[PDB]
Symmetry: D2
Subunit: 385 residues, 4 copies
């Protein structure tokens, strides 16, 4: 099979909750379940047809055995369904989709779901096993420890972004200008109904969560006045960096033959996927390497892409990527992104792909690129049908 | 490419340490690093040739950001290396190998490493985020919580095995006879040098660990006298169940063309891989379903397999599998298995595949099948060259 | 010296804060310090004249070394000051005053301070020393563990009160009638300025706390509708039981000769003090035994007492005491008590004595009696001067 | 009554266990119970005669409600017994005895027990109430926090002793010579049966503990080679400092009339007791102030004392005291002390007084002086009968 036989037939996501707010105490498995139910309904695919699942999740500590399996069974899929979780840090939700695409292209399965999820609100604290040392010891926060602190440099991802910003002269002012644009684009897209197709609501004990929570949590006048968040002479702030958040996003994928068999409407097809990596501290420049890689795989050029989703881990990252590759900013993150919508780590790679699946006009091509802790980036190109 | 173009060029593993013993306080990333260095040396592949890695690990809590990436960089691979972790519970180390094989068959990479790892000794305890409730709360053990307790039934995997045993009249006495056979087969294999090819030693603080620790921790006379370990009227005991353990196993994989390009000797080729699943409590019968699936994928019958590695999660599992499929016990787990060697959850699926890579005679075919928490099983068939 | 040579020359207290409210995160040592500063100012005694201190405190876990010493030095007393803490559970603040009286009567010191304090809001959770058990363990709440759970019966003090109530036919309706009367008496006393002399304010980061917090936290209409708080068929509820609270109360004591020497005005003199005890579960009836004991020591009869302070651990306790001894309810707890003002365990015994010191008319006699966990009660009689 | 009417009729103690060794996991209440049963047997006083108890204990966190009451009821005393715990840090066990003596001299009771206890092995760790902060927090060790860290200087008691040592030219070599002498004196006293009268054995899970554990844990050749334990340029070491330990010591006290009434033999009588204090960091010089105070109270001079027990918190303390007061070293701590026997904080002040009760010859006078965290010291003088 060619890669273009791989089609997306549904996509859905939860709203993104703010840290310890809308989805406080809601396990990641609930978020995943509801996004997966939503995606299957979007695809008009009964859960019993799903043969295999790949779900990204980065810090599932204390969510119980096999949270990916919990999501799949919770959504009503048969116990015969094959399930795997993946962790490629911030790229997890994209890499899950790639893994699903690979087994479809090899005809190992016909109907597969994939996506990503994270509940950062529910990440626990750790106490190591064994004798608690005389004099006491630290209760470790799983979010920096397993999620956001770079191991090799022992600095937070935002401090790494400061390093990249300084190296490439991406100024505080440029980062804040971009951050404001993201917040404004998020609000405009919500007002215009842009997310209506992809969003499914959740009831939380009772209120209904149906809208991204983060993008209203902003004061434009204060943005240029904020102190650096990560290093004393830094440029990255809480406003121009992504936030801690909760959410899940899922897609339903099959082959052109599977879609015909079940009377399904293909929404998009795969053109290319892949990954690149560089030094851990420089994860922010890795999208600029994965993008030419997946363009070459797709036999495309930069001008052939109608929309870019370059995950906004920090304003630094799309700014670097756009200027280094010569991208048109009016075609990049046009409905906002993680600086204003938030970054549930395992979710975001799946969210941005599912967004392209729904928001591209038929015939248009979209490229998603997402940097990840450790120095990597995932990339993916799709064609809307 | 056909699947048979995928070849194994190296395999290695750490010894398996016993719980809080040989590798006490040794992080999983150290074990994985040493297994990967060993596998690359076994393959005569310099680390800079590795393009991508998939590593299984089930409970990496508090091992820091991206433990799979830590292993790959620790082993001397280039920062350009693409890395992903996978969690399919007990099948993780096998599923990692399958994911590597898929991208090789699609010619998305040429040189890939895969494996699995676990440090159960270093799994922490958890405290949830937010208000500690008045009256106190439980510090949660990550091992049962994220590793070995079935979430749907809220019973341990050993209690699930009790259920399967009673349903299919697999007696205490049969389980104990099988357990004793496993311990004896492990000891004999160690004496006969069977593991010399696959084992790499580790220095720990300063002792050298060069031999599996678990298989000596047994008293045959006491085995029939042990009390049930999981349920009051149960048949599963500490002796006839797998144990908590630490270890890592890795393989190096390429295509027939890659091997030619780099002057490498293929050790084995892929014939088939896949997965099956059933009700979570019945994971013990899932290998009996995946085995016919992968045999069909390879165009083979039971008689065509020379050696079986059916992971010994509990003696129940190989016993069920052998009697249901009509397997010859003299061809099953002939060098011991997880009842006597231990079960570092993320490691075992990679261990048993790497063991077949080294221990099969040229021209022989081996099938590995590994049940996993949640109801699944992974299967794989390879041919020795 | 006769006991009547022992005189009180000052008394003060903090307001009583509600649990995790006004004095949340304010250590017990701050509360103690401010009450002691206040008492010394009330007595017109410069801190440098204080020779010795006894301070009651029941659960000072994590308040640091020698919280009583911290209070005394914090209040400006000389480092030459002798300091001891006492724990007689709920009687601690009274027993401290008794110990001070004893050394004054023996002429071992001339100027002594005494009182009691508790920050229940700041009581920590406990994790035992050593190996955290496989499978996890409970984080223990210090409030029930060291404060309010009876060790011998392994039931809460309120459950003990249920037992006593049932035994002596003290009904739910009688308890609620008494509780309402306490809440109304507390509000009336506050309105009438009754506490103005004894109260000192605290600034907390900034707001000024100057009024007891608990007595407004009531709904009279709901009181008869509440469910039992401690046992399924019980009579004790949250409304007719004392609450968890924060506060400190201190007195300054000397001899008649010391008062003359320093030009001080005696506010009251000691007539008797002592203790009684019975079975732990029956602590509620112990005040009825200590009262005749201290009357006999003072050579007095019940009719000679103008005001009674019978600590309101539960409405059960003053109800039992009044009916069994034939006390006039119009002379008992006339300005409210712990059911409506709260029960910071180590404080209350000192609070009720200091209240009598200020509120008795000159020449009147007051008797304070306070039951304590373990089965005890303290008693004290004073004469206003 | 004169103070000399107060008599000791019995004394006993547990052996002192080493940290997490002989009495590991044995609660302080068990140690206190056995010491109290032993003291009552030594006195030939049936438990039902005991009217009141004062028991020292410094860090009873997680030992449950009213550990002093638990000890008294555990020893078989009647529920009518009045019980109080006291905390004067290291002086607690002595101050308890003083409080008992005061109420006997005032004829408020006739038969009273007093002592001190500590299980440092069972001291827990603390987690504060309320929100665990983002990023984690420290699990606090109760031993330094509530027992051995000076709050004002935020340094350990051993570092305070370094300061006193340097100020007064008490050298490392002098401290080590004194330490060695203590270890040798402890061993010799054990061999000569000196402790046979005061010791009572305990059964622990099943071994019998009948001898002090600490004084054998020494290597004389290594003592001059140890590194400073508290400050980089310090003189105090693990060997010449007291250790962490578990134990309890109790006495039985009455009046001359009480002894006659019950047919008891007075062992010793009280001559004086009291306390002094100075700056917290200088607790090591406080015994040199309390000793002249209690000598004056007794109408005695230094030459009138036959044996001194100056608690060996650090070798610094008896060295300072002896050279400042001109004491004969051959009359000081002649059977060892806390440097070699250990320092269960709440116990030691009672241990050294009970030791004088048994080891003084009839007609001899003994003075005990014990420094305490916070800057204090307790003193006591008794006369053997
Ligand atoms: K932001
Ligand atoms: K076993
Ligand atoms: K109340
Ligand atoms: K020592």
């Amino acid at each position: 099979r060619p890669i273009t036989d791989v089609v997306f037939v549904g996509a859905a996501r939860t709203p993104i909750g703010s840290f310890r707010s809308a989805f406080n105490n809601v396990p990641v498995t609930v978020l995943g379940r509801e996004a997966l139910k939503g995606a299957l309904k979007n695809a008009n695919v009964k859960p019993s047809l799903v043969q295999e699942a790949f779900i990204g999740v980065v810090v599932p500590s204390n969510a119980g055995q096999g949270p990916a399996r919990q999501v799949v069974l919770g959504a009503g899929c048969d116990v015969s369904t094959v399930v795997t979780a993946v962790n490629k840090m911030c790229a997890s939700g994209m890499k899950a989709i790639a893994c699903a695409a690979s087994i479809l292209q090899l005809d190992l399965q016909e109907m597969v779901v994939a996506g990503g999820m994270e509940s950062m609100s529910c990440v626990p604290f750790y106490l190591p096993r064994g004798e608690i040392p005389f004099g006491g010891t630290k209760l470790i926060d799983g979010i920096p420890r397993d999620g956001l602190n770079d191991v090799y440099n022992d600095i937070l991802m935002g401090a790494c972004a400061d390093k990249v910003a300084k190296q490439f002269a991406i100024t505080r002012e440029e980062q804040d200008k971009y951050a404001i644009l993201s917040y404004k684009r998020s609000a405009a897209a919500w007002k215009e109904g842009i997310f209506a197709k992809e969003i499914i609501p959740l009831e939380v004990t009772t209120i209904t969560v149906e809208e991204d929570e983060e993008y209203k949590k902003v004061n434009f006048e204060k943005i240029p006045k904020l102190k650096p968040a990560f290093t004393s002479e830094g440029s990255v702030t809480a406003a121009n960096a992504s936030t801690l958040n909760d959410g899940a996003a899922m897609v339903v994928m099959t082959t052109v033959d599977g879609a015909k068999k079940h009377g399904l409407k293909p929404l998009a097809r795969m053109l290319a996927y892949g990954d690149a990596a560089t030094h851990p501290i420089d994860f922010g420049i890795a999208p600029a390497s994965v993008i030419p890689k997946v363009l070459k795989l797709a036999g495309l050029q930069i001008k052939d892409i109608d929309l870019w989703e370059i995950n906004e881990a920090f304003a630094v990252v799309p700014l670097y990527t756009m200027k280094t590759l010569g991208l048109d900013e009016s075609k990049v993150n046009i409905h906002g992104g993680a600086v204003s919508l938030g970054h549930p780590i395992g979710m975001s790679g799946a969210r941005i792909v599912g967004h392209l699946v729904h928001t591209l006009k038929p015939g248009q091509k979209g490229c998603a690129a997402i940097c990840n802790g450790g120095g990597g980036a995932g990339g993916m190109i799709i064609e809307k049908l």
